[PDB]
Amino acid sequence: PFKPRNYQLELALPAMKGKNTIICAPTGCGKTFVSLLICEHHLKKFPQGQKGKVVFFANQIPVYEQNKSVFSKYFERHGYRVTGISGATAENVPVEQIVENNDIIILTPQILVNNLKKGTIPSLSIFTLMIFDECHNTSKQHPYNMIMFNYLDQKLGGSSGPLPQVIGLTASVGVGDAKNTDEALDYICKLCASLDASVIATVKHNLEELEQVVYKPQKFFRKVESRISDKFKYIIAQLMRDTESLAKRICKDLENLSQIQNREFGTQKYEQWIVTVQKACMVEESRICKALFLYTSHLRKYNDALIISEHARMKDALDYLKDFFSNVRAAGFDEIEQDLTQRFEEKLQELESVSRDPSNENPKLEDLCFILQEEYHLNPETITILFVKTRALVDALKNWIEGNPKLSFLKPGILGDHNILIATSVADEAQCNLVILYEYVSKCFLLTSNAGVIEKEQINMYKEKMMNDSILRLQTWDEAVFREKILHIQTHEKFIRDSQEKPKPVPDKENKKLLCRKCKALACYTADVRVIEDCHYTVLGDAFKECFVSRPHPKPKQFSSFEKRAKIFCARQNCSHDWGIHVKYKTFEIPVIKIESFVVEDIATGVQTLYSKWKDFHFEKIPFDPAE
RNA sequence: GGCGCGGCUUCGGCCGCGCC
Ligand SMILES: Nc1ncnc2c1ncn2[C@@H]1O[C@H](COP(=O)(O)OP(=O)(O)O)[C@@H](O)[C@H]1O
Ligand SMILES: [Mg+2]
Ligand SMILES: [Zn+2]
């Protein structure tokens, strides 16, 4: 929409000269505009009586929509036809002819992947230009790389057939698991080879101009020491062991109700354990599961508390708990809750003692405080964003600030104007000169007690430098030499790809059995299992329908050719294991099951085999026929 | 349901972000 910056002009040059190029430029510097310039040029270069055809790949839906609107709006004067296909722009719309009848097409990559496989789009020769957004994803088995495997099979396999020009956009080509500066460079050449790029476009002549429009904060690291003696954790942990023991009383097999393993009190993974346990027990069986929901609620609160105590001050954790229980005994208040609240009360005074103890303060907070003093002394006109781990840590930090004499110059608020200069939050849901990551996940401070976090961070910094040095070096090579290297890397990768064919599994045609992984009851047999479109597995017969119950899906999805309309579970007395889903498929109401919800058992022997994915299950897979 | 990519892994997986 607005007038091109000089670096944008510079970045679009190699592409406009027809070269396959990767445009590597910082986020928000305007690569999409560069792609608009390249696209405009590409379509305009064709003499009257010919046409180009441009395809643009967005890896995600929001990007897809944004660029559909942007490319549509930009190309109105030109009169070019602009449409796009997403997983929703389906399915009774003939894709081949949508490509025939358009000039610019925005695709999610999987769509091209599918139609290429199904033969409905015979060749990428239908395109004259392919633009890959987030092009650093063009590796391994990713959709981008499937598309490029098709390209390269056409280029190398000698089936010509003109090929389209290929350009990619990224903010970072990356280096992978490179340890030295030569492994990094080799990875980069591998990326170029995947995309058939012979040119990497970086800003070289307008650096000092690009610099002015880019958020590149000064990155700082302060490792902070965790609390020396912590007796708050010990007490709360004992409460959690207690209530877990209570929850096991109404649910014997509690330790096996969740897939999540080796939970630790006061961690995020414990929270995740909570969530999976609660979605496994849905509110006669409602009584057991409701009680279970109570226990796991209190366990959730305790987990929260531990985390608060870890990163804020024990007073904050204990306040949080006190308020929670004040809520419980003011909107409850049946036996289990009275019992739980009492068990808390029996420890309340010791917790109370341990909290107000000077030895039990958090030095981490002193560190953060210090950073705030210094920075607001160097510039009191400073706007800060303070990232914390949990919702509760937001409030803990806010109270801590409002009640800290040394920070009486900060007017805080959570997610302006006469007084809000620091905002505490969890996710970003740019105008802030000071960014602080206080135990999370222009200046930027990372504060953590975890040396591993810092280690990884310094590793990523070093990687960035290896990447930049490597690109710089690459760009000095004559294009011919580089194309020759690219050629032979591509030849090599192609050989590996074709040599490492499957081969077809050859099935064990013997009848095996299928039981609910949880309660081991008879679900069905393998001879009763049909495959729908290569990848989906259903079961035949009414005898199977007595073994599952249906229950409306939280989020109905319209995927491929199916219509997910229900979640399905075991029918037993309070198993209710997640078996899979129920779909409307074409005209049929059928169940679709996942192999991870079943134990396979050999009928003759009794041994039990376990399978994560149907890909790994090698049985006489009978193709599904409707009239049965 | 299935696929892809990441982070951990007791290599049994677990989790996260996406896509069809
Ligand atoms: N030359 C320019 N002058 C002013 N604003 C621009 C210019 N180029 C891009 N912008 C704006 O800045 C934003 C950059 O976004 P985008 O180009 O998609 O960034 P990225 O290339 O990192 O994805 C765009 O939304 C655009 O509206
Ligand atoms: Mg972009
Ligand atoms: Zn069951």
Short mmCIF file of C-alpha atoms and ligand atoms in Angstrom, two decimals, chain A residues 516-521 570-572 575-577 579, ligand 3:
data_model
loop_
_atom_site.label_atom_id
_atom_site.label_comp_id
_atom_site.label_asym_id
_atom_site.label_seq_id
_atom_site.Cartn_x
_atom_site.Cartn_y
_atom_site.Cartn_z
CA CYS A 516 -10.25 -51.42 25.69
CA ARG A 517 -6.70 -50.58 26.90
CA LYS A 518 -8.22 -49.48 30.24
CA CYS A 519 -10.61 -52.27 31.25
CA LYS A 520 -9.58 -54.99 28.71
CA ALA A 521 -13.19 -55.69 27.61
CA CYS A 570 -16.21 -47.58 26.08
CA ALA A 571 -19.70 -48.56 27.30
CA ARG A 572 -18.61 -50.32 30.49
CA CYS A 575 -14.55 -47.11 32.08
CA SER A 576 -15.49 -44.59 29.47
CA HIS A 577 -12.12 -44.68 27.73
CA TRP A 579 -12.00 -44.81 21.90
ZN ZN C 3 -13.35 -50.07 28.64
#
